[PDB]
Each structure stands twice: as structure tokens, then as C-alpha cells.
Amino acid sequence: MNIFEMLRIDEGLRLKIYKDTEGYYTIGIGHLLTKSPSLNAAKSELDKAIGRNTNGVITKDEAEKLFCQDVDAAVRGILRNAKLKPVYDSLDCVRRAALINMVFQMGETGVAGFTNSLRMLQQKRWDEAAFNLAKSRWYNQTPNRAKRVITTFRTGTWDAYK
């Protein structure tokens, strides 16, 4: 198990434009295209992202390329963030994966605002952090995924993914 296999499990793989859990146009392995209600806007974002006229469909190779960029972007976002970097630096590799997962799903700014949970993680109070993380819209709206991610933070193991 690793960050790519973890997110592939959590995000799935679909080669045609679809709506994600929040109702937003998405493709590939959780590649958010746009929060716009317009399918045409989503198609234009897709063509720009892939560099050709796709008409709403991509190949597995193309999906994996967007995925690589998106994981890269989540890590870069963490490293550039004054709130996230200290926490990330303090974690082991498995828990780093859990943080990357959250940022991938919610964005840098979204996760950076979880001040209390981040403090507990930095303090290595794993059970307390886990309980605090579950007090979130994130947990309530995607409970099975959030439970897997929280288990990863709680245990520092890949048990929730095996």
C-alpha cells in the first residue's frame, strides 16, 4: 500500500466525465474538473487539462497522468502551507499519506483550517485526533472514506486499506 494505491481505492477510476460525491464534474481518479453546473464548462476544462479535444472521454493512461499531477499538487500544497507543513514534517510516512489524502479530497485551504485536529496530530495524540476529526462535515458526508483515513491517522498502519 502507498499514497497512490490508497487514493485509487478512495477515488475509483472512471474514464468518462461523472459527478463526484458533491455533485461536481470529475473524471479519472478523482480529478475535479470544475464546480460549475455546466457540462460544457467541464468539457472545456478537460480538453485544457489533457491537451486535446476529448469530448468527455479519456484513456486510462491520461487518467493516471492527471492523478500523478494531482497527488504532486496535494504534496506541494502541504509543503507551501504554514499550517500544514509543520504537521506533515512531524508525521511518519503512513500518516503523511493520510494527510495527503485529505488535501487531495478537500484542498490545501480546507484542511489547513482544521486547527484543533492538526494540533492533536502534531502532539501525537492519535486517539484524540481521531475523535476530533470525526466531528466534521467531511466525516458526515463521506463516512466510510473518512473512517479509513482516520484509522490510518489513529494507527499509523494500512489496516483500513487491506
CA distance 72 to 74: 6
Number of CB atoms found within 10 A of residue 68's CB: 12
- Residue 135, phi then psi, degrees to nearest 5: -90, 60
Q: Nearest distance from residue 63's CB to a second copy, in Å?
A: 12
Give the x-and-dash track for 23-62 against a second copy (CB under 8 A). --------------------------------------x-
* Residues 88-127 interacting with a second copy (rule: CB under 8 A): 93-94, 96-97
Q: What cell numbers appear for 110 in the block?
A: 480546507
- Rounded Cα distance between 135 and 50, Å, is 37
61 counts as catalytic: no
Selected from 44, 90, 122, 136, the binder of Cl ion by CB under 5 A is 44
Report the C-alpha gap between 19 and 12 in whole angstroms. Answer: 12
- From residue 62 to residue 91, what is the string marking binding to a second copy with x (rule CB under 8 A)? --xx-xxx-xx--x---x------------
Q: What is the DSSP letter of 36?
A: -
**Residue 114 assigned ligand-binding role:** no
Q: Is 48 in the site for Cl ion (CB under 5 A)?
A: yes
User: Taking the CA of residue 90 as centre, how many other CA atoms within 13 Å lie in the half-sphere pointing to its CB?
Assistant: 15
Annotated binding site for substrate: 32, 104, 117, 132
Q: Which positions touch Cl ion (CB under 5 A)?
A: 44, 48, 142, 144-145
**Residues annotated as catalytic (active site), given as ranges:** 11, 20
